[PDB]
């Protein structure tokens, strides 16, 4: 069994007939049943993508007044997903239709895109250009954005439901 990425489960031996343009021919067939190994793609592709999405969602827990920090954070997360998607698809055959891992990568990429859009929407409603001083009981200060407050629940929840549906559909 000189297989790297496959497990040879077994063989099925059979016989049949083929009716060609020149006549009927007996055809003896064997079928080797192979199952792919998934651990490589878990460690190299799925799990870094999951952690990058978790990073993109961690932006919601930073204070809204750190505009450059969250901007750089989201855009660099998008760049990281671009790199991961490129590396992932380098290791596929050039099929037309979409594989499962392609759908996973696309959904994660959409998630980081939506996280950056969420930060943009939060920043649009920020009033004051200074953060909490550290020694005041709430000069006025920006309130915690409702958008951030419920995005902290909506985004990880939606990602978890997508993960459950994905890993139930295929496994």
């Amino acid at each position, epitope marked *: 069994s000189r297989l790297n990425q496959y497990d040879l*489960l*077994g063989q*099925t031996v*059979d*016989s*049949g*007939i*083929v*009716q*060609s343009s020149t006549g009927e021919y007996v*055809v003896m*067939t064997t*079928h080797f*049943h192979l199952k792919r190994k998934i651990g490589y793609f878990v460690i190299q592709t799925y799990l870094p993508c999951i952690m990058t999405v978790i990073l993109s969602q961690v932006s919601f827990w930073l204070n809204r007044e750190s505009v450059p920090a969250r901007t750089v954070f989201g855009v660099t997360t998008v760049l990281t997903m671009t790199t991961l998607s490129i590396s992932a698809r380098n290791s596929l055959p050039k099929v037309a239709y979409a594989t499962a891992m392609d759908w996973f990568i696309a959904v994660c990429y959409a998630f980081v895109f939506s996280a950056l859009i969420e930060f943009a929407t939060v920043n649009y409603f920020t009033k004051r250009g200074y953060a909490w001083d550290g020694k005041s009981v709430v000069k006025t200060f920006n309130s915690v954005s409702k958008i951030d407050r419920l995005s902290r629940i909506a985004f990880p929840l939606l990602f978890g439901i997508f993960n459950l549906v994905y890993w139930a559909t295929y496994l």
Partner: nanobody
Amino acid sequence: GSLRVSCAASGRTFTTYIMAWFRQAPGKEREFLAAMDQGRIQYYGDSVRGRFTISRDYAKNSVDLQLDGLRPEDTAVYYCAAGAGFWGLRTASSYHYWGQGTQVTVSS
């Protein structure tokens, strides 16, 4: 008596899939009858070898089963199935697509 049971597939192209016919007599046992693969290679069950003929129209994405020499015990429900044969090609579990079925009866 002679008969021909056709099966048209819609919603997906089954060029690469193995299209097969199964039989189910009363008593709940499914019996493999015939199958054709992408290579036009015909596999048959021992009970119906040389009697039933399976063919495929890949352009129309259909599979036909010609039944010749019917006997009373052939009365059963015939199912059209498709799917790549993994661990199978003679087992119903290897097929992920199934038809509604067609009842066939023979009277003497």
